[PDB]
Amino acid sequence: EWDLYDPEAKKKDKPARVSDDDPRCGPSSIQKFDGEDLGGKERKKLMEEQMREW
Amino acid sequence: TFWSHHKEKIPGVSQIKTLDTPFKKNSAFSKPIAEGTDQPQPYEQETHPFL
Amino acid sequence: IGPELQSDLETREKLTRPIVRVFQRHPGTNLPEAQGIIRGAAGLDESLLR
Amino acid sequence: MRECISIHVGQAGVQIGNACWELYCLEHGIQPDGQMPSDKTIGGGDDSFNTFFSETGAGKHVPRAVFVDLEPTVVDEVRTGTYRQLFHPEQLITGKEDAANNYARGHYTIGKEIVDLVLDRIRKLADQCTGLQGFLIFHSFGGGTGSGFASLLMERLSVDYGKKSKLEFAIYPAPQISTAVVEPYNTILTTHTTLEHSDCAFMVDNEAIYDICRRNLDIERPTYTNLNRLIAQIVSSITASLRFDGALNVDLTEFQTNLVPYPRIHFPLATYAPVISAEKAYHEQLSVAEITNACFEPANQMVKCDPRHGKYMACCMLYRGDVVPKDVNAAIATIKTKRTIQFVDWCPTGFKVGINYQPPTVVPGGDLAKVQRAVCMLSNTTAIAEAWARLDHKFDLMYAKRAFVHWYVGEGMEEGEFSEAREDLAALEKDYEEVGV
Amino acid sequence: DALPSLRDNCAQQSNTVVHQYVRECRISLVKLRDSFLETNEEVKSLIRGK
Amino acid sequence: SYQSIPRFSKLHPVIPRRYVPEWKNDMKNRELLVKNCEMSGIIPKGPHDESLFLDKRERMNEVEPRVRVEAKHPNFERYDGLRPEFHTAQSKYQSSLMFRKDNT
Amino acid sequence: QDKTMTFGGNGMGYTRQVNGNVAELLGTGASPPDAENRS
Amino acid sequence: MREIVHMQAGQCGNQIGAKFWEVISDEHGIDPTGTYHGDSDLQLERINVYYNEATGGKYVPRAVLVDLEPGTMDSVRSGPFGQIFRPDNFVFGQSGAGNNWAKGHYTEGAELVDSVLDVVRKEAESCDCLQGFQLTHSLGGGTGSGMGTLLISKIREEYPDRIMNTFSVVPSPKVSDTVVEPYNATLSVHQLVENTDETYCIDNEALYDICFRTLKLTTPTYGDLNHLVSATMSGVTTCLRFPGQLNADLRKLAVNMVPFPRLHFFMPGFAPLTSRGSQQYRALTVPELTQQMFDAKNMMAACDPRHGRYLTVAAIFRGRMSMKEVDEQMLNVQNKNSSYFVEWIPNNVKTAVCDIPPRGLKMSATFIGNSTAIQELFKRISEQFTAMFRRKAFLHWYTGEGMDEMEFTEAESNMNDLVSEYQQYQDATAE
Amino acid sequence: MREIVHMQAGQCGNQIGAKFWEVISDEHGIDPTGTYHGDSDLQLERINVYYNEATGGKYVPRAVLVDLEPGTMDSVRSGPFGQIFRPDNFVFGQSGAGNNWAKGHYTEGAELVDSVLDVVRKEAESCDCLQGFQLTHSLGGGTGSGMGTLLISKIREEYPDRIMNTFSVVPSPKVSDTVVEPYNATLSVHQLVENTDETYCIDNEALYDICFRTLKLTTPTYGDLNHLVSATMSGVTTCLRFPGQLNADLRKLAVNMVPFPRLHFFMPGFAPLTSRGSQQYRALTVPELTQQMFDAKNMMAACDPRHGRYLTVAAIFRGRMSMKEVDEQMLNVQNKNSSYFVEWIPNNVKTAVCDIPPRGLKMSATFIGNSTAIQELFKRISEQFTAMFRRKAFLHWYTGEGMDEMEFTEAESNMNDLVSEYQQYQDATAE
Numbered sequence A: 001e002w003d004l005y006d007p008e009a010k011k012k013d014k015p016a017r018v019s020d021d022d023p024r025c026g027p028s029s030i031q032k033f034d035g036e037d038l039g040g041k042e043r044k045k046l047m048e049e050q051m052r053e054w
Numbered sequence B: 001t002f003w004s005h006h007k008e009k010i011p012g013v014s015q016i017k018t019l020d021t022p023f024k025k026n027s028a029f030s031k032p033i034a035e036g037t038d039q040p041q042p043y044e045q046e047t048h049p050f051l
Numbered sequence C: 001i002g003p004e005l006q007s008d009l010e011t012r013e014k015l016t017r018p019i020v021r022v023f024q025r026h027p028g029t030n031l032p033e034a035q036g037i038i039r040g041a042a043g044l045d046e047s048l049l050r
Numbered sequence D: 001m002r003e004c005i006s007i008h009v010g011q012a013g014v015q016i017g018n019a020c021w022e023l024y025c026l027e028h029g030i031q032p033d034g035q036m037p038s039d040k041t042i043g044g045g046d047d048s049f050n051t052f053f054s055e056t057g058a059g060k061h062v063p064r065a066v067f068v069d070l071e072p073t074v075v076d077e078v079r080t081g082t083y084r085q086l087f088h089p090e091q092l093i094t095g096k097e098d099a100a101n102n103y104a105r106g107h108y109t110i111g112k113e114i115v116d117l118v119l120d121r122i123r124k125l126a127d128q129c130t131g132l133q134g135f136l137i138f139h140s141f142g143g144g145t146g147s148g149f150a151s152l153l154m155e156r157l158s159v160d161y162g163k164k165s166k167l168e169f170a171i172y173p174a175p176q177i178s179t180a181v182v183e184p185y186n187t188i189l190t191t192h193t194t195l196e197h198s199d200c201a202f203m204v205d206n207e208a209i210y211d212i213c214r215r216n217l218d219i220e221r222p223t224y225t226n227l228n229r230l231i232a233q234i235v236s237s238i239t240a241s242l243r244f245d246g247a248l249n250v251d252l253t254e255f256q257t258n259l260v261p262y263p264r265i266h267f268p269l270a271t272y273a274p275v276i277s278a279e280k281a282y283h284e285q286l287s288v289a290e291i292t293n294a295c296f297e298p299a300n301q302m303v304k305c306d307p308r309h310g311k312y313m314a315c316c317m318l319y320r321g322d323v324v325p326k327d328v329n330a331a332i333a334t335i336k337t338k339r340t341i342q343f344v345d346w347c348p349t350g351f352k353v354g355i356n357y358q359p360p361t362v363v364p365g366g367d368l369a370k371v372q373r374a375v376c377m378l379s380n381t382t383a384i385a386e387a388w389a390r391l392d393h394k395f396d397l398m399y400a401k402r403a404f405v406h407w408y409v410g411e412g413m414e415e416g417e418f419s420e421a422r423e424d425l426a427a428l429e430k431d432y433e434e435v436g437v
Numbered sequence E: 001d002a003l004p005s006l007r008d009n010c011a012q013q014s015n016t017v018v019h020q021y022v023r024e025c026r027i028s029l030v031k032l033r034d035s036f037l038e039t040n041e042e043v044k045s046l047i048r049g050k
Numbered sequence F: 001s002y003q004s005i006p007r008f009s010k011l012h013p014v015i016p017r018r019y020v021p022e023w024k025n026d027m028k029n030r031e032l033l034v035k036n037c038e039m040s041g042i043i044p045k046g047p048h049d050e051s052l053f054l055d056k057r058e059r060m061n062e063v064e065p066r067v068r069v070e071a072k073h074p075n076f077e078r079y080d081g082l083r084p085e086f087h088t089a090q091s092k093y094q095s096s097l098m099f100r101k102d103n104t
Numbered sequence G: 001q002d003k004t005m006t007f008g009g010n011g012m013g014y015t016r017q018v019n020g021n022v023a024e025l026l027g028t029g030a031s032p033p034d035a036e037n038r039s
Numbered sequence H, I: 001m002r003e004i005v006h007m008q009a010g011q012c013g014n015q016i017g018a019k020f021w022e023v024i025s026d027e028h029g030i031d032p033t034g035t036y037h038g039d040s041d042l043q044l045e046r047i048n049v050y051y052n053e054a055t056g057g058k059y060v061p062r063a064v065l066v067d068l069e070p071g072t073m074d075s076v077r078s079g080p081f082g083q084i085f086r087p088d089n090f091v092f093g094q095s096g097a098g099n100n101w102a103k104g105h106y107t108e109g110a111e112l113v114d115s116v117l118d119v120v121r122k123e124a125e126s127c128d129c130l131q132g133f134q135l136t137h138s139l140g141g142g143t144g145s146g147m148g149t150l151l152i153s154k155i156r157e158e159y160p161d162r163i164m165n166t167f168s169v170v171p172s173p174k175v176s177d178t179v180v181e182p183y184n185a186t187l188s189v190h191q192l193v194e195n196t197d198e199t200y201c202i203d204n205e206a207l208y209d210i211c212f213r214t215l216k217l218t219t220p221t222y223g224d225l226n227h228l229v230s231a232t233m234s235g236v237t238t239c240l241r242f243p244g245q246l247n248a249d250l251r252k253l254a255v256n257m258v259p260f261p262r263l264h265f266f267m268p269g270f271a272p273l274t275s276r277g278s279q280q281y282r283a284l285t286v287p288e289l290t291q292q293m294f295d296a297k298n299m300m301a302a303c304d305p306r307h308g309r310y311l312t313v314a315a316i317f318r319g320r321m322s323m324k325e326v327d328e329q330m331l332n333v334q335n336k337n338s339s340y341f342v343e344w345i346p347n348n349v350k351t352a353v354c355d356i357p358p359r360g361l362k363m364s365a366t367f368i369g370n371s372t373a374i375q376e377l378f379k380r381i382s383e384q385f386t387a388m389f390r391r392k393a394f395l396h397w398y399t400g401e402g403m404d405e406m407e408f409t410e411a412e413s414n415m416n417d418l419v420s421e422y423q424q425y426q427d428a429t430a431e
């Protein structure tokens, strides 16, 4: 039973997600949402460029 | 467009067999059989001229 | 009549400021805060029409 | 299978229809020859044009429209113009003798001889149709073909088709601008078929569109083409849910159900917000909050009536483009907390919002700026009764010493029609006041 | 005709009556509190007697 | 089994949407608050009609009678309202308060 | 000092001032000799 | 081999169900074609609970998609995980609903219900144990409310011994988005309370608030909403699909959570829900999951737990963990905030533990609460209903599609006395 | 396993707390990214007092960060040791009251106080045997005084027995930074008296002249003032955080300092203190530390202790050092300046000898005096308050905000009561 009941086992685990491209998190981890606008700033720059040129 | 870039993650988008814009409504799945023109259903191959 | 938007109404002027809220924490209560303003607004409106 | 039949009656209706079908063909990629250079569709995977056009075996896409007018001029102009190869020859029905700006002449003498032919053409179009949403009737209240013949056609359509949506787009006379003289008589006479036969009648006002084009589009000298293009933009924003994918899709029946409270109250104001000119779009954000506030601003309305002197019964906002429901709800909350917009007491709700993905298309050589965001508000309010008050004030002071009545009596109608129609419009004004109170 | 200070005047009416109510509640609270300490001391004495 | 028929006052755009007093909804001292309403006998404990402000109006129906809500007047007179003391925030209306004269 | 239009004060209290206002608004007062020396 | 038949009505219900089958296909390692591509046999034992065998190793979901608008049918067929569903259980009509409960119930919505019940009957007697029926929809439109309640009534008339859990997205007044949603909600709550014996009411404003505070989520849209709803959809039935230290299925939750028959509207929740900026500052511990379950802002039904008393609380945990730690946390919450708990029920918590976490996380949790604070949304719906029923607004549509005002009066009276029953059981002495 | 929850409010509070967390981090070996890189084993033993352990080697602080303007919030986040704080513990309003007790207490902060109590209750729940709460509020300003004392009142209702210490950055009569700081100080230390277990009040001009005279150093700015206050705050709890030869925590300090419930206002003092030029020419010994503690110029308050009687004096020593020298030095001090000690309290000095010295030095000492000469600070504050309030200057900003003059008068009256009680125990005799 020691594998999780170790007092220093909190120093051995990755938090939940680590980075933004972590393979283990998916649609069932309920932590990789599609709502974060990672490309939001690039999209805003593209919209500004399109509006200016038009 | 937000919806254009996050297309294929958007809830309501139907059967993008169109390249200039994706939001033209493809209603080939509904198509009750009295006026059906044998359109390609969203999970099968196309016809001669593939287009 | 107040300002033309409820966002810029300021916390010392809304009818449910925290002073009023800690008063309404007990039963009965019911400050006569809005009926007087309604009556004054109606009187001023009738003055404008006359 | 969703489809609509567009009936354009009168010179105003025909010209507005010309602009509308130009916008529709540009939106769906159909060139004015009538053939679709698809060139990007994979197979027959495009069903967006079904609601307006009928693809035939020659590669052509004939529109689902009927153009009728009693003088041959503008209809023959359409036959001699560019869209000759696009319109069906028998859809553009025309007469010989004009209706002479006369409701009696358009309803009892000249309108009784081609009503059978236009009803036959409508019958063929509806039999070709199989999922008909309804009829978009474009006309003017100025008088003649757009008043009398339109009234007779609407009566006949209500008798035969029955449970079908009939959305009316009516040119309304201005408070003080006018181009005719007997158009108060014509409007008073045609209040009935837009009151007891219509289902949702959007009035538009030439002064309001003139002021919009003078202040927002920077057009010092505008013609009717810009007005008709704006009306085309509005009707395209209305019908976009039937032909483009969207987050919330608002069809015609759902639109009417969420708009009209009572069968008598079916006259909502219409507002379109993208409105800025091309050079002035460089300086404005044109966000969701801005385009929602531009609709409720009492200067972009397309009827010359101030909505601050009234109560909003309901609003149907149709957002178009990169508009997200969180910004929609934030704009709705700001509008609801705003003091100026006053909603009626029996409607704690009142915002039917429908988000559509496909952003609007810009006409080549247009005046509207090409934008990413759009809103089209269709608001039922009690402030439209000011236009009727001005109208029947004009009618009363005309009809005091019986001016122009001899023409109508000679073309057949009785004098009691004026009294009955005046009393019906007075009842409508009292009904709107009673609803608002 | 109503004064052009009706909203502020009514708000400070509400503030004054809330202030009077909370001073009287403070008096009632300190009375209840010293009664509570008297009860607690008596309970301690009774426990020791037991 | 009885009739509710709620009644609301005139619209005023200072009313902040929907507001419920927290004495009806306090789940820490409710066993004292509700029995206080019972012992008073004029304050209804009923579950509905909690929002005395629903849209932009006040509830004239059973959230306390008009007696004891219209009686909270801290002795205000127009004679002392037209001449505000200098150290308070109401003295900046003196440019318009002296325009009114004084009769009653 | 200068009035300051506060509530009851110097006796009676919130409940007694409200009851007096109720009596005044509904009709005659409660009684003259009520609240002897404000108890 | 107990197994659940899923039904989904309306655009909202269809999109929630599509996200739900996406989530529980990731949980079993099933590609959208239908094959099993997982690694362990634990994802393959109880695959029959939601999926039915086809030829080869293909798994067709036991789901029925119903709508009166074909556009949403095309959208959910051609969207993500649209290939998993069978085209035969895509029964639809080509008319629409018009946000009309009368049109969805007493008109052409009742034309489609024959084929709908034929499909549901085919799936129901394609079973061997048939644990129950699980419906998702919204009480804001025509097909979601009217047709959904028609299926509820007919399925309960057919099989009145099966666990019927429906979720339903209730309308929030500060989201609006429809003008006749109080009419649609009042005419459907009557059928929900009378027939359905398990309801997990979900609110869009609560979902938006969760997205905007606990997840930042600069532009959440309708994807994240259905994603969280699917999380709580899987967390209530995880013990049927995976083994655990302390199992509890839908019937056990209904027994331990519903004290009286018309007392069954719940307040779902999920944990952990961590923002990207606070990802590295958080250590997943059982007390932390217990707190995020018992946080007010984490609720998914727009109620405030402090604004009422809990009757019963189901706590379903997932992952390897300690039963002592779980039990001490769920006892410590009762000992701490005992005022927000009814005193006539000792041990207001049902506790379930499953030792199979979701893919990704090592631990997760699911809250279900039969709180008496659920009455406030019903009161808001009732006050909007009487606001737009005072002047008989928008009734000509319903009378045209064949309803009288007496049905509206029944709906109002039933909602009023249901809220009064909540208040009476809430303000009850111990004995 | 005794825990302290730290709270910073206002610009000065956030800056002082940031410097405090910096010294705690490099005293316990915590690097800017929050990972233990220390050398001794006696640095991670008692670290749960101030740090909540996270996943990996992360150690977040148990602090609550409060403001009504985000400028100081962004400055603290962008500065060094800013990534250690949890992003949930950054509660800030948007308007900003600003030099206004009424706007900081009755409104603005009075709706943010619910979320701040949520965070404070969260940190208190995430503990075992919580020692209490320390605040670094900044009397004389806006959010620090009014909303800070509001937080003190609410957490005193919530947790009545846990030790409350504030650090009280009380204004000056001759610095003259704010025109309404007498109003704020008079109206807020009234709230401090009835609510705090103990206040370690620190002014600004004594920090100025300790830097100018004891340290010279010609550039303290605010950083070195925060360093001095921060060193004192570490010294008042080094016996709790580290093993020692004679331990004394905050409760022991409060019990041995206060003789009466409203005499809990302390004069702090840190006394290893020398310039760069006099660093090597100054022997570091226990008598030298005691001599620098019992010096009027080394006091962190404006109150000269020569005209005033000490009630109780605490010496928290840090280092490997001899009890015989410590006791002989306190006895020597009591024998020499016997006229500055009250006769009715014999042996009124407390020893608290720890083991681990602060980083860099080898011995240190923290002085906690409870002299009766502290009444003159409140005397000057009340003199300025009664100079302003006679003409009712700057009073509309409070009265139209929502207060009244009766609260000002009663605050002045209880200020005079506190001053009179300090004078009574200054003039009290033995028999």
Ligand SMILES: Nc1nc2c(ncn2[C@@H]2O[C@H](COP(=O)(O)OP(=O)(O)OP(=O)(O)O)[C@@H](O)[C@H]2O)c(=O)[nH]1
Pocket: D009, D010, D011, D012, D013, D015, D016, D069, D070, D071, D098, D099, D100, D101, D102, D140, D141, D142, D143, D144, D145, D146, D147, D171, D178, D179, D180, D206, D224, D225, D227, D228
């Ligand atoms: N916006 C807009 N209004 C038009 C246009 N053409 C005509 N109108 C309006 O129509 C009114 C007069 O009615 P007409 O349309 O000219 O006459 P009609 O409806 O064709 O009937 P007849 O008189 O028999 O020809 C005028 O007051 C104009 O405001 C147009 O192209 N655009």
Ligand SMILES: Nc1nc2c(ncn2[C@@H]2O[C@H](COP(=O)(O)OP(=O)(O)O)[C@@H](O)[C@H]2O)c(=O)[nH]1
Pocket: B011, H009, H010, H011, H012, H013, H015, H016, H097, H098, H099, H138, H140, H141, H142, H143, H144, H145, H169, H176, H177, H178, H204, H207, H222, H223, H225, H226
């Ligand atoms: N949470 C959530 N709500 C939705 C979604 N789609 C629609 N809704 C809500 O459902 C309501 C309208 O219901 P609707 O889809 O028209 O029901 P239908 O007419 O039966 O299809 C709106 O108020 C939306 O807020 C979704 O994907 N997620």
Ligand SMILES: Nc1nc2c(ncn2[C@@H]2O[C@H](COP(=O)(O)OP(=O)(O)O)[C@@H](O)[C@H]2O)c(=O)[nH]1
Pocket: I009, I010, I011, I012, I013, I015, I016, I098, I099, I138, I140, I141, I142, I143, I144, I145, I169, I177, I178, I203, I204, I207, I222, I223, I225, I226
């Ligand atoms: N010792 C010290 N005092 C400070 C510091 N920053 C500001 N102050 C003092 O704090 C007072 C202003 O308080 P402030 O922080 O503005 O309170 P707030 O308005 O609630 O944020 C001024 O008189 C300054 O002298 C600092 O870093 N150290």
Ligand SMILES: [Mg+2]
Pocket: D010, D011, D012, D071
């Ligand atoms: Mg013409």
